[PDB]
Amino acid sequence: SNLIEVFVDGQSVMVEPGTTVLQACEKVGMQIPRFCYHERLSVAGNCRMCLVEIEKAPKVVAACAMPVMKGWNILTNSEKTKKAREGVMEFLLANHPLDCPICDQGGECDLQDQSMMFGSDRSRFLEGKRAVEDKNIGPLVKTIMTRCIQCTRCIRFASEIAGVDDLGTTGRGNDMQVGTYIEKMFMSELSGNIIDICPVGALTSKPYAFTARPWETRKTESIDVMDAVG
């Protein structure tokens, strides 16, 4: 009742009528690459990394924002999907500078755990690499806005849960930027909690800045006691 069997790689599963292709393929234990998407946020689509070749169609669709019709064959690995996940993640790895000796998210960036598995082998660009300038906002958010692959993820968070309407999009085409037009500081509750959301190492912590790389720590779970909600 209230379901459609969709053959994800030729294998049945029953979802709600009106869910997403992403949640369907993640239900059967698979990962499609995720840049312009978050579960705890709204949904946009302006990275165009999830691209699956749907069966009985010459075109390619993106799994972020579309419903699922009567049961398709969501052909995950094809000889054309790998001509797309290689495709998009060759452009955005060009207009970007050669950091990571010094990029402080250097052990967990999503241009670094996608780029071994998916994507191409070498480069053919071979000169270019625009370089914008940075600024300061508060004494907590160490700020390199050069890297900033414009996935529109920090931007919606101002309209999301933290209701401070502060950020925007300034520019057109190749040249757009993310930071505040005026030099207004941005600080309230949750204001230091953006540096987890930024999926590359363009945003990071100010006191933590130059200490140690994230493959030497020992992750032990615990609880903080500085408030009554735990």
């Binding site: 009106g18 579960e39 949904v43 924002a65 419903p67 931007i155 919606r156 309209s159 309407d165």
Partner: protein
């Protein structure tokens, strides 16, 4: 007290094995028989997310500034 190294006693201190499930999780701790304590697996909500309802006529679920 010569370098500041993390020299130590506590001879085990680094032993992690790879279990398959909760079923044989207990059965290994009892077969050699020392005390233990068990957590629980947390799986999240499924959950209900749908684009299109982010543009309303009278609702509150409405995004801007995208």
């Amino acid at each position: 007290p010569l370098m500041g190294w993390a020299s130590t006693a506590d001879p085990l201190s680094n032993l992690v094995l790879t279990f398959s499930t909760k079923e044989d999780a207990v059965a290994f701790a009892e077969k050699n028989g020392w005390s233990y304590d068990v957590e629980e697996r947390k799986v999240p909500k499924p959950k209900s997310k749908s684009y299109g309802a982010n543009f309303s006529w009278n609702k509150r679920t409405r995004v801007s500034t995208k």
